[PDB]
Amino acid sequence: SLDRLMNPLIDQYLYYLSRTQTTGGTTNTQTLGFSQGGPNTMANQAKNWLPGPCYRQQRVSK
Amino acid sequence: VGNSSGNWHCDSTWMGDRVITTSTRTWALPTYNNHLYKQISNSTSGGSSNDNAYFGYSTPWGYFDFNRFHCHFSPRDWQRLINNNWGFRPKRLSFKLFNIQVKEVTQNEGTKTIANNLTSTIQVFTDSEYQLPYVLGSAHQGCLPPFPADVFMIPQYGYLTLNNGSQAVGRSSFYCLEYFPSQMLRTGNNFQFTYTFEDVPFHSSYAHSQSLDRLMNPLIDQYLYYLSRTQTTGGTTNTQTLGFSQGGPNTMANQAKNWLPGPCYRQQRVSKTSADNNNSEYSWTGATKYHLNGRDSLVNPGPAMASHKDDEEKFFPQSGVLIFGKQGSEKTNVDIEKVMITDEEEIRTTNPVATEQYGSVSTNLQRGNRQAATADVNTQGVLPGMVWQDRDVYLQGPIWAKIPHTDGHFHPSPLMGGFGLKHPPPQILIKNTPVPADPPTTFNQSKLNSFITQYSTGQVSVEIEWELQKENSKRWNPEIQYTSNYYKSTSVDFAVNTEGVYSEPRPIGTRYLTRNL
Amino acid sequence: QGPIWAKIPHTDGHFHPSPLMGGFGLKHPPPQILIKNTPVPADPPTTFNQSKLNSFITQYS
């Protein structure tokens, strides 16, 4: 599938946004935590292509 | 045994409109799972996410990873390329591999002697039919050393299939390369092969001298008209009327153009300045994404876009562009200073800005009793009349990608940027040959599990012959160029600190030379 | 027990380039030949690791 075309044993050598606020105790402040894409965070890994075109339709049951 | 398997051919040369290049590098080879296969899903896990579910197999094999540029071009040279040509396209590709050796390892009482076993071997092959799941186009680390003198290990290999959570479907497939012919190889014996690309549109490495709204003449006016008045304006009275006018040098904004900006995908904006961002964790929730088969996945880097508009250097798209990390970076929650972001101000010329609306439209038809309706557009498809430029490439970036062998593909230009092909270069895979240990004295039905752990190594290179369209611009004014600033710096650029670690100062673009639109 | 020749700086201006230590100069002097032992890594890990290698078999030729 379009989201599983990469290798599971490695990580992208790029980074992506993973933190908007601090997480170390009982305090909230503006911060920025960046990280690479791992085998455990595949969902966020940067892909290279895009799904196809679409037209929403109402659903129905058998 | 007493003869080199070839010479170290690694240079950069320019004979004119073509450029040849090769880089020799030394690698290593480790066995895996003791020559055994595997199954992988939420196992050596994370816990529960139809979005983080997977299904694949770790094979005892390894492969090559050189889909980047800093692996074929030293910086300077790349520069040379940039300031002189407008576009290029790689045509030829050679591959050499030699000087193999085999090492074994006996770990007795912590005392381990490492000698060679010149009689062992390995086997490699290629897939010229692309029957094996393609692994590249994912920019997985472990590319050839951006540097030439260092050495590296070859990343193991594993693929995946159509899955359903922690279970697979019937149609799920399962392959085993041990089913493919492979030039066997013993020490001293060499191996090489060759392939040649096919036709491809030269990735245009340049910017534009005008924007889609300023392509007309300032001294004249369109001989057409446009709506300029809905009501009267002559005193203290309001009545329905219609004032039409031509397009002048003072009303350029309204002048009828002939073409249309490119496609778009709205994204949330963010700042490099920590305090200017809202105080809420929206990294995963307020993020732009698509829905597929229940698994919701992010849309990165998404379509071609513009990082920001003028003077918005503080912001960039939430997940609209690439990011890099200076050498020494680790896996997670690192800060912004250990990384580098990509500036895309070069496309404001023709493509929209990610954190910006595409434009507005109406939702109704007014009358004397109905108010003028006006909505917004953050999602946009394409129509006849659009033009854009794909994402620019970066030296520390990917080079090409495998076009999915399907019935429908459109302007297959990859998103990370680069080049696509219906028949991409091939994947080469190697593994240490298995060699069993002392077997029993009598028979035993079961197969073997005891082998001499060993590893092998050697050096390789690759030749690339490209094409390039040299510039013909007669712009009089001196364009911009790429250069290391002339002030004094403690640590040189692309140098190696007093420790030998080689790091890059900033990422590098190619859209430097400005060519007319 | 002295030097034999020296590299004339590739410049636009040079005069009676006769070296000072004495000897012979040339616009295109003999060449420099350089050699090094080829690197050979040690036992690498069983799984992957992004970073490059630093462990090799120390040897000499």
Short mmCIF file of all heavy atoms in Angstrom, two decimals, chain A residues 3-15 19-21 29-30 32-36 40 42-44 46-49, chain B residues 51-52 68 138-141 158 160 274 277-282 297 300-301 323 329 331 333-335 396 402-403 414-416:
data_model
loop_
_atom_site.label_atom_id
_atom_site.label_comp_id
_atom_site.label_asym_id
_atom_site.label_seq_id
_atom_site.Cartn_x
_atom_site.Cartn_y
_atom_site.Cartn_z
N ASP A 3 1.46 3.48 1.87
CA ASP A 3 2.12 3.90 3.10
C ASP A 3 3.11 2.88 3.63
O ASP A 3 3.78 3.12 4.64
CB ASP A 3 1.07 4.22 4.17
CG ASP A 3 0.09 3.08 4.39
OD1 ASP A 3 -0.50 2.59 3.40
OD2 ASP A 3 -0.11 2.69 5.56
N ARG A 4 3.22 1.76 2.94
CA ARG A 4 4.15 0.73 3.37
C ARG A 4 5.00 0.29 2.19
O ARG A 4 4.83 -0.81 1.66
CB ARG A 4 3.37 -0.45 3.94
CG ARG A 4 2.26 -0.03 4.90
CD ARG A 4 2.78 0.84 6.04
NE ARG A 4 1.70 1.39 6.85
CZ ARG A 4 1.86 2.31 7.79
NH1 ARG A 4 3.06 2.79 8.07
NH2 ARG A 4 0.80 2.75 8.46
N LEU A 5 5.93 1.15 1.80
CA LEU A 5 6.78 0.92 0.65
C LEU A 5 8.21 1.15 1.06
O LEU A 5 9.12 1.11 0.24
CB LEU A 5 6.38 1.91 -0.45
CG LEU A 5 5.01 2.55 -0.18
CD1 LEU A 5 5.15 3.55 0.96
CD2 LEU A 5 4.49 3.24 -1.43
N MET A 6 8.39 1.40 2.34
CA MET A 6 9.71 1.65 2.90
C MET A 6 10.26 0.44 3.65
O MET A 6 9.61 -0.60 3.74
CB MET A 6 9.64 2.84 3.85
CG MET A 6 8.27 3.52 3.91
SD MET A 6 6.96 2.47 4.61
CE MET A 6 7.15 2.78 6.38
N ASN A 7 11.47 0.57 4.18
CA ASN A 7 12.06 -0.52 4.93
C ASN A 7 11.79 -0.36 6.41
O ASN A 7 11.98 0.71 6.98
CB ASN A 7 13.56 -0.62 4.71
CG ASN A 7 14.18 -1.70 5.57
OD1 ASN A 7 14.17 -1.60 6.80
ND2 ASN A 7 14.72 -2.74 4.94
N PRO A 8 11.37 -1.44 7.06
CA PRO A 8 11.04 -1.55 8.47
C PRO A 8 12.22 -1.60 9.41
O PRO A 8 12.07 -1.35 10.60
CB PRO A 8 10.24 -2.83 8.53
CG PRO A 8 10.97 -3.67 7.53
CD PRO A 8 11.13 -2.72 6.38
N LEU A 9 13.38 -1.94 8.90
CA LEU A 9 14.54 -2.04 9.76
C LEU A 9 15.32 -0.75 9.90
O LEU A 9 16.22 -0.65 10.74
CB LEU A 9 15.47 -3.14 9.25
CG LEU A 9 15.07 -4.56 9.64
CD1 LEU A 9 15.40 -4.81 11.12
CD2 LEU A 9 13.59 -4.78 9.36
N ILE A 10 14.97 0.23 9.10
CA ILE A 10 15.71 1.48 9.18
C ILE A 10 14.85 2.70 9.43
O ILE A 10 13.65 2.61 9.66
CB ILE A 10 16.51 1.70 7.90
CG1 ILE A 10 17.03 0.36 7.40
CG2 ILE A 10 17.65 2.65 8.18
CD1 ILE A 10 17.80 -0.41 8.44
N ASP A 11 15.51 3.86 9.36
CA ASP A 11 14.86 5.13 9.60
C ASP A 11 15.24 6.14 8.52
O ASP A 11 16.33 6.08 7.95
CB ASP A 11 15.30 5.64 10.97
CG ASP A 11 15.50 4.50 11.97
OD1 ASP A 11 14.49 3.88 12.36
OD2 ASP A 11 16.66 4.22 12.36
N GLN A 12 14.33 7.05 8.23
CA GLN A 12 14.60 8.08 7.24
C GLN A 12 15.66 8.95 7.88
O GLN A 12 15.65 9.13 9.10
CB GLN A 12 13.35 8.92 6.99
CG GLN A 12 12.11 8.12 6.63
CD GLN A 12 10.91 9.01 6.38
OE1 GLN A 12 9.85 8.54 5.96
NE2 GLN A 12 11.05 10.30 6.64
N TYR A 13 16.58 9.47 7.09
CA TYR A 13 17.62 10.32 7.65
C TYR A 13 17.13 11.76 7.77
O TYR A 13 17.92 12.68 7.99
CB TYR A 13 18.88 10.28 6.80
CG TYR A 13 18.63 10.55 5.34
CD1 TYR A 13 18.88 11.81 4.80
CD2 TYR A 13 18.13 9.56 4.50
CE1 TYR A 13 18.64 12.07 3.46
CE2 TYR A 13 17.89 9.81 3.16
CZ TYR A 13 18.14 11.07 2.65
OH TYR A 13 17.91 11.32 1.32
N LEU A 14 15.83 11.95 7.62
CA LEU A 14 15.23 13.27 7.72
C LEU A 14 14.54 13.40 9.07
O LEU A 14 14.53 12.47 9.88
CB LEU A 14 14.21 13.49 6.62
CG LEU A 14 14.74 13.44 5.20
CD1 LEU A 14 15.37 12.08 4.91
CD2 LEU A 14 13.59 13.72 4.25
N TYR A 15 13.94 14.56 9.30
CA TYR A 15 13.26 14.79 10.55
C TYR A 15 11.88 15.32 10.30
O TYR A 15 11.56 15.73 9.18
CB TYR A 15 14.05 15.78 11.39
CG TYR A 15 15.37 15.22 11.81
CD1 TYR A 15 16.50 15.39 11.02
CD2 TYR A 15 15.49 14.46 12.97
CE1 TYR A 15 17.71 14.81 11.36
CE2 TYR A 15 16.70 13.88 13.34
CZ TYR A 15 17.81 14.06 12.52
OH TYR A 15 19.01 13.46 12.86
N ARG A 19 7.03 17.60 18.47
CA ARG A 19 6.69 18.28 19.73
C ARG A 19 6.33 19.74 19.58
O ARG A 19 7.06 20.51 18.96
CB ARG A 19 7.83 18.20 20.74
CG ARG A 19 7.90 16.94 21.56
CD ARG A 19 8.71 17.17 22.83
NE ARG A 19 8.70 16.00 23.71
CZ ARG A 19 7.60 15.33 24.06
NH1 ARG A 19 6.41 15.71 23.60
NH2 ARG A 19 7.69 14.28 24.86
N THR A 20 5.22 20.13 20.18
CA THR A 20 4.79 21.52 20.13
C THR A 20 4.92 22.13 21.54
O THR A 20 5.06 23.35 21.68
CB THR A 20 3.30 21.63 19.66
OG1 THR A 20 3.06 20.74 18.56
CG2 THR A 20 3.00 23.06 19.21
N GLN A 21 4.87 21.28 22.57
CA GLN A 21 4.96 21.73 23.96
C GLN A 21 5.91 20.85 24.74
O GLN A 21 6.25 19.76 24.30
CB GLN A 21 3.59 21.68 24.64
CG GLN A 21 2.53 22.50 23.92
CD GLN A 21 1.15 22.36 24.54
OE1 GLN A 21 0.51 21.32 24.46
NE2 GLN A 21 0.68 23.43 25.16
N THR A 29 4.81 24.77 28.23
CA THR A 29 5.45 25.91 27.59
C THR A 29 5.75 25.61 26.13
O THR A 29 5.91 24.45 25.74
CB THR A 29 6.78 26.30 28.31
OG1 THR A 29 7.67 25.18 28.31
CG2 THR A 29 6.51 26.74 29.75
N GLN A 30 5.83 26.67 25.34
CA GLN A 30 6.10 26.54 23.92
C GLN A 30 7.52 26.02 23.70
O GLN A 30 8.49 26.57 24.24
CB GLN A 30 5.95 27.90 23.24
CG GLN A 30 4.93 28.85 23.86
CD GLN A 30 3.49 28.34 23.83
OE1 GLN A 30 3.02 27.83 22.81
NE2 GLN A 30 2.79 28.49 24.94
N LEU A 32 9.95 23.00 20.82
CA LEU A 32 9.95 22.27 19.55
C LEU A 32 10.82 21.03 19.58
O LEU A 32 12.04 21.12 19.62
CB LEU A 32 10.44 23.16 18.42
CG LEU A 32 9.75 24.50 18.24
CD1 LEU A 32 10.40 25.21 17.06
CD2 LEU A 32 8.26 24.31 18.00
N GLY A 33 10.19 19.86 19.53
CA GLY A 33 10.95 18.63 19.53
C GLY A 33 10.87 17.94 18.18
O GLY A 33 9.79 17.55 17.74
N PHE A 34 12.01 17.81 17.52
CA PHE A 34 12.04 17.15 16.23
C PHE A 34 12.61 15.76 16.33
O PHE A 34 13.43 15.48 17.20
CB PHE A 34 12.83 17.99 15.24
CG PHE A 34 12.05 19.13 14.70
CD1 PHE A 34 12.32 20.43 15.10
CD2 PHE A 34 10.99 18.90 13.82
CE1 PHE A 34 11.55 21.50 14.63
CE2 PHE A 34 10.22 19.96 13.35
CZ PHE A 34 10.50 21.26 13.76
N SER A 35 12.19 14.89 15.43
CA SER A 35 12.67 13.52 15.45
C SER A 35 12.70 12.88 14.07
O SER A 35 12.11 13.39 13.12
CB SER A 35 11.79 12.69 16.39
OG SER A 35 10.42 12.91 16.12
N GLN A 36 13.40 11.76 13.97
CA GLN A 36 13.49 11.05 12.71
C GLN A 36 12.29 10.13 12.62
O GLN A 36 11.45 10.10 13.52
CB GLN A 36 14.77 10.21 12.65
CG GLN A 36 16.03 10.96 13.05
CD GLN A 36 17.31 10.22 12.70
OE1 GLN A 36 17.65 10.05 11.53
NE2 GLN A 36 18.04 9.78 13.72
N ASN A 40 8.75 2.29 14.45
CA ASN A 40 7.67 2.33 15.41
C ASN A 40 6.76 3.54 15.18
O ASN A 40 5.67 3.61 15.75
CB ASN A 40 8.26 2.37 16.83
CG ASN A 40 9.66 2.96 16.87
OD1 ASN A 40 9.87 4.11 16.48
ND2 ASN A 40 10.63 2.17 17.33
N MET A 42 6.19 4.68 11.86
CA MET A 42 5.99 4.66 10.41
C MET A 42 4.90 5.62 9.93
O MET A 42 5.03 6.24 8.88
CB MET A 42 5.63 3.26 9.95
CG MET A 42 6.69 2.20 10.25
SD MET A 42 6.28 0.55 9.59
CE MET A 42 5.66 -0.30 11.06
N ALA A 43 3.82 5.74 10.69
CA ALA A 43 2.72 6.62 10.29
C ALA A 43 3.16 8.04 9.90
O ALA A 43 2.59 8.64 8.99
CB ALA A 43 1.69 6.68 11.42
N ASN A 44 4.18 8.55 10.57
CA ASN A 44 4.64 9.91 10.33
C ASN A 44 5.73 10.07 9.29
O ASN A 44 5.98 11.18 8.83
CB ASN A 44 5.14 10.49 11.64
CG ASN A 44 4.17 10.27 12.77
OD1 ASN A 44 3.14 10.95 12.87
ND2 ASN A 44 4.47 9.30 13.63
N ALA A 46 7.92 10.52 6.13
CA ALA A 46 7.65 11.22 4.88
C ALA A 46 7.70 10.24 3.72
O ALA A 46 8.68 9.55 3.51
CB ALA A 46 8.68 12.31 4.68
N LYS A 47 6.61 10.19 2.96
CA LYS A 47 6.50 9.31 1.80
C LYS A 47 6.85 10.13 0.58
O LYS A 47 7.20 11.30 0.71
CB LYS A 47 5.08 8.81 1.66
CG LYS A 47 4.55 8.12 2.89
CD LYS A 47 3.05 7.90 2.82
CE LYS A 47 2.56 7.18 4.07
NZ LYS A 47 2.99 7.86 5.33
N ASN A 48 6.75 9.54 -0.60
CA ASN A 48 7.07 10.30 -1.79
C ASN A 48 5.94 10.45 -2.77
O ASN A 48 6.02 11.28 -3.66
CB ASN A 48 8.24 9.70 -2.54
CG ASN A 48 8.51 10.45 -3.83
OD1 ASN A 48 9.04 11.56 -3.82
ND2 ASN A 48 8.12 9.86 -4.95
N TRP A 49 4.91 9.64 -2.65
CA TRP A 49 3.83 9.77 -3.60
C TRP A 49 2.51 10.04 -2.92
O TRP A 49 2.44 10.13 -1.69
CB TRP A 49 3.72 8.52 -4.46
CG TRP A 49 5.03 8.08 -4.97
CD1 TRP A 49 6.12 7.74 -4.23
CD2 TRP A 49 5.40 7.87 -6.34
NE1 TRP A 49 7.14 7.33 -5.04
CE2 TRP A 49 6.73 7.39 -6.35
CE3 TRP A 49 4.74 8.02 -7.56
CZ2 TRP A 49 7.41 7.07 -7.53
CZ3 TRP A 49 5.42 7.70 -8.74
CH2 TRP A 49 6.74 7.23 -8.71
N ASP B 51 -2.92 2.45 12.30
CA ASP B 51 -2.06 3.37 11.59
C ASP B 51 -0.58 3.00 11.77
O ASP B 51 0.27 3.45 11.02
CB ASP B 51 -2.32 4.78 12.10
CG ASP B 51 -2.25 4.86 13.60
OD1 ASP B 51 -1.14 4.66 14.14
OD2 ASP B 51 -3.30 5.12 14.23
N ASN B 52 -0.28 2.21 12.79
CA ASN B 52 1.09 1.80 13.01
C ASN B 52 1.19 0.29 12.99
O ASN B 52 1.99 -0.30 13.71
CB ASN B 52 1.63 2.37 14.33
CG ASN B 52 2.81 3.32 14.11
OD1 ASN B 52 3.42 3.78 15.07
ND2 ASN B 52 3.13 3.60 12.85
N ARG B 68 21.10 9.08 -3.09
CA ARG B 68 21.27 10.42 -2.56
C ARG B 68 22.31 11.05 -3.46
O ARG B 68 22.77 10.41 -4.40
CB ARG B 68 21.76 10.39 -1.10
CG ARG B 68 20.63 10.27 -0.09
CD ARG B 68 21.00 10.89 1.25
NE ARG B 68 21.70 9.98 2.14
CZ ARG B 68 22.07 10.29 3.38
NH1 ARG B 68 21.80 11.49 3.86
NH2 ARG B 68 22.70 9.40 4.14
N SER B 138 12.73 5.72 -0.05
CA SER B 138 12.30 5.87 1.32
C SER B 138 13.34 6.60 2.11
O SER B 138 13.19 6.81 3.31
CB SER B 138 12.03 4.51 1.93
OG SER B 138 10.96 3.86 1.26
N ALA B 139 14.42 6.95 1.43
CA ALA B 139 15.48 7.71 2.06
C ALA B 139 15.90 7.13 3.40
O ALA B 139 15.95 7.84 4.40
CB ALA B 139 15.03 9.14 2.26
N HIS B 140 16.20 5.84 3.42
CA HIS B 140 16.63 5.23 4.66
C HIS B 140 18.10 5.45 4.86
O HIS B 140 18.90 5.26 3.94
CB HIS B 140 16.31 3.76 4.65
CG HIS B 140 14.85 3.50 4.65
ND1 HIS B 140 13.99 4.16 5.50
CD2 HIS B 140 14.08 2.69 3.88
CE1 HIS B 140 12.75 3.77 5.25
NE2 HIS B 140 12.78 2.88 4.28
N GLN B 141 18.46 5.85 6.07
CA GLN B 141 19.85 6.10 6.38
C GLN B 141 20.73 4.91 6.02
O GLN B 141 20.24 3.82 5.73
CB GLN B 141 20.01 6.46 7.86
CG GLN B 141 19.09 5.70 8.79
CD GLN B 141 18.61 6.55 9.95
OE1 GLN B 141 17.94 7.57 9.75
NE2 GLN B 141 18.95 6.14 11.17
N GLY B 158 14.44 -5.87 4.58
CA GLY B 158 13.11 -6.35 4.93
C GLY B 158 11.99 -5.61 4.23
O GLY B 158 12.02 -4.39 4.09
N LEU B 160 7.45 -5.62 3.18
CA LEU B 160 6.14 -5.79 3.78
C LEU B 160 5.09 -6.13 2.75
O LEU B 160 5.36 -6.11 1.55
CB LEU B 160 5.74 -4.50 4.50
CG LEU B 160 6.88 -3.72 5.15
CD1 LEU B 160 7.67 -2.94 4.10
CD2 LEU B 160 6.30 -2.77 6.18
N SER B 274 9.88 29.64 19.31
CA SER B 274 9.04 28.85 20.21
C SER B 274 7.79 29.52 20.81
O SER B 274 6.70 28.94 20.76
CB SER B 274 9.92 28.31 21.33
OG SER B 274 11.07 27.67 20.80
N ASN B 277 3.97 30.12 18.92
CA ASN B 277 3.09 29.04 18.52
C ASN B 277 2.07 28.82 19.61
O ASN B 277 2.35 29.04 20.78
CB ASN B 277 3.91 27.77 18.30
CG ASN B 277 5.18 28.03 17.52
OD1 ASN B 277 5.14 28.62 16.44
ND2 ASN B 277 6.31 27.59 18.06
N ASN B 278 0.87 28.39 19.23
CA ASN B 278 -0.16 28.15 20.23
C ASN B 278 0.38 27.10 21.20
O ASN B 278 1.27 26.32 20.86
CB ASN B 278 -1.44 27.63 19.58
CG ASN B 278 -2.63 27.66 20.53
OD1 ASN B 278 -3.61 26.93 20.35
ND2 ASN B 278 -2.56 28.52 21.54
N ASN B 279 -0.16 27.10 22.41
CA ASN B 279 0.26 26.16 23.43
C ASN B 279 -0.69 24.95 23.49
O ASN B 279 -1.48 24.82 24.42
CB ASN B 279 0.31 26.87 24.79
CG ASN B 279 0.93 26.02 25.88
OD1 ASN B 279 2.09 25.61 25.80
ND2 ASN B 279 0.14 25.74 26.92
N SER B 280 -0.59 24.08 22.48
CA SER B 280 -1.43 22.89 22.41
C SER B 280 -0.71 21.84 21.57
O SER B 280 -0.10 22.17 20.55
CB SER B 280 -2.78 23.22 21.76
OG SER B 280 -3.49 24.22 22.48
N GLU B 281 -0.75 20.58 21.99
CA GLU B 281 -0.09 19.53 21.22
C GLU B 281 -0.99 19.08 20.07
O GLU B 281 -1.93 18.31 20.26
CB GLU B 281 0.26 18.32 22.11
CG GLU B 281 1.55 18.48 22.97
CD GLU B 281 2.87 18.37 22.19
OE1 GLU B 281 2.84 18.27 20.94
OE2 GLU B 281 3.95 18.38 22.83
N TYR B 282 -0.69 19.59 18.88
CA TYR B 282 -1.45 19.30 17.67
C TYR B 282 -0.59 18.60 16.65
O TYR B 282 -0.98 18.46 15.49
CB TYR B 282 -1.96 20.60 17.06
CG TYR B 282 -0.87 21.64 16.90
CD1 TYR B 282 0.43 21.28 16.54
CD2 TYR B 282 -1.15 23.00 17.10
CE1 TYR B 282 1.43 22.25 16.39
CE2 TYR B 282 -0.15 23.98 16.95
CZ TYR B 282 1.13 23.59 16.59
OH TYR B 282 2.11 24.55 16.44
N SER B 297 -2.94 8.30 7.73
CA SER B 297 -1.53 8.62 7.73
C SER B 297 -1.26 10.05 7.29
O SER B 297 -1.99 10.62 6.49
CB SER B 297 -0.72 7.65 6.87
OG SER B 297 0.66 7.78 7.16
N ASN B 300 3.16 13.84 4.21
CA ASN B 300 4.44 14.52 4.15
C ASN B 300 5.31 13.92 3.08
O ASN B 300 5.35 12.71 2.90
CB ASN B 300 5.15 14.41 5.50
CG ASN B 300 6.31 15.37 5.62
OD1 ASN B 300 6.30 16.28 6.45
ND2 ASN B 300 7.33 15.16 4.79
N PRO B 301 6.04 14.77 2.33
CA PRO B 301 6.04 16.23 2.49
C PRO B 301 4.85 16.84 1.77
O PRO B 301 4.71 18.07 1.72
CB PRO B 301 7.36 16.63 1.86
CG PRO B 301 7.43 15.70 0.70
CD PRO B 301 7.04 14.37 1.33
N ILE B 323 13.63 18.27 6.20
CA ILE B 323 14.42 18.70 7.33
C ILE B 323 15.65 17.83 7.44
O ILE B 323 15.59 16.64 7.16
CB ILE B 323 13.64 18.58 8.64
CG1 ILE B 323 12.20 19.05 8.45
CG2 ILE B 323 14.31 19.44 9.69
CD1 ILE B 323 11.32 18.06 7.70
N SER B 329 23.36 13.68 15.40
CA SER B 329 21.98 13.70 15.86
C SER B 329 21.50 12.29 16.19
O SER B 329 21.97 11.31 15.60
CB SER B 329 21.11 14.34 14.79
OG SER B 329 21.58 15.64 14.48
N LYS B 331 17.93 9.70 17.47
CA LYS B 331 16.58 9.39 17.01
C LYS B 331 15.34 10.24 17.36
O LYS B 331 14.56 10.56 16.47
CB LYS B 331 16.25 7.92 17.35
CG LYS B 331 16.34 6.99 16.16
CD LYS B 331 15.46 5.76 16.35
CE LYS B 331 14.00 6.14 16.51
NZ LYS B 331 13.53 6.99 15.37
N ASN B 333 12.93 13.38 19.79
CA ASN B 333 12.75 14.60 20.57
C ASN B 333 13.92 15.55 20.60
O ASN B 333 14.10 16.28 21.58
CB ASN B 333 12.36 14.26 22.01
CG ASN B 333 10.89 13.94 22.14
OD1 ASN B 333 10.40 13.68 23.24
ND2 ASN B 333 10.17 13.95 21.02
N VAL B 334 14.73 15.55 19.55
CA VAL B 334 15.86 16.45 19.52
C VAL B 334 15.29 17.83 19.25
O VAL B 334 14.16 17.96 18.77
CB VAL B 334 16.87 16.07 18.42
CG1 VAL B 334 18.23 16.65 18.76
CG2 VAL B 334 16.95 14.55 18.28
N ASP B 335 16.06 18.86 19.56
CA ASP B 335 15.59 20.22 19.35
C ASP B 335 15.81 20.75 17.94
O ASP B 335 16.32 20.05 17.07
CB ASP B 335 16.26 21.16 20.35
CG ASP B 335 15.61 22.53 20.39
OD1 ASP B 335 14.47 22.63 20.90
OD2 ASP B 335 16.22 23.49 19.89
N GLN B 396 21.87 16.71 0.01
CA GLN B 396 21.73 15.68 1.03
C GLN B 396 20.38 15.03 0.86
O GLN B 396 19.82 14.49 1.81
CB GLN B 396 21.82 16.29 2.42
CG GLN B 396 23.12 17.00 2.70
CD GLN B 396 22.91 18.35 3.37
OE1 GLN B 396 22.31 19.26 2.79
NE2 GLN B 396 23.40 18.49 4.60
N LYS B 402 10.90 4.65 -7.56
CA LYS B 402 10.21 3.67 -8.38
C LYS B 402 8.77 4.02 -8.66
O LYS B 402 7.96 4.11 -7.74
CB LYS B 402 10.28 2.31 -7.68
CG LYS B 402 9.36 1.25 -8.25
CD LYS B 402 9.68 0.94 -9.70
CE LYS B 402 9.52 -0.55 -9.98
NZ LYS B 402 8.19 -1.10 -9.58
N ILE B 403 8.44 4.21 -9.93
CA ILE B 403 7.07 4.52 -10.29
C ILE B 403 6.27 3.24 -10.13
O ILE B 403 6.62 2.20 -10.68
CB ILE B 403 6.95 4.96 -11.75
CG1 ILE B 403 7.88 6.13 -12.01
CG2 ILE B 403 5.51 5.35 -12.05
CD1 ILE B 403 7.83 6.60 -13.44
N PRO B 414 8.07 12.57 -8.54
CA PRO B 414 8.03 12.22 -7.12
C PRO B 414 7.80 13.46 -6.28
O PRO B 414 8.02 14.58 -6.75
CB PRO B 414 9.42 11.64 -6.87
CG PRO B 414 9.83 11.13 -8.22
CD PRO B 414 9.37 12.22 -9.13
N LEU B 415 7.38 13.28 -5.04
CA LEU B 415 7.13 14.43 -4.17
C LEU B 415 8.38 14.92 -3.47
O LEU B 415 8.60 16.13 -3.34
CB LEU B 415 6.06 14.09 -3.16
CG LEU B 415 4.70 14.06 -3.86
CD1 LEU B 415 3.67 13.49 -2.93
CD2 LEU B 415 4.32 15.46 -4.29
N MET B 416 9.21 14.00 -3.01
CA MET B 416 10.44 14.37 -2.35
C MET B 416 11.27 15.04 -3.42
O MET B 416 12.28 15.69 -3.14
CB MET B 416 11.16 13.13 -1.87
CG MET B 416 10.23 12.13 -1.24
SD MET B 416 11.04 10.58 -0.90
CE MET B 416 11.47 10.80 0.83
#
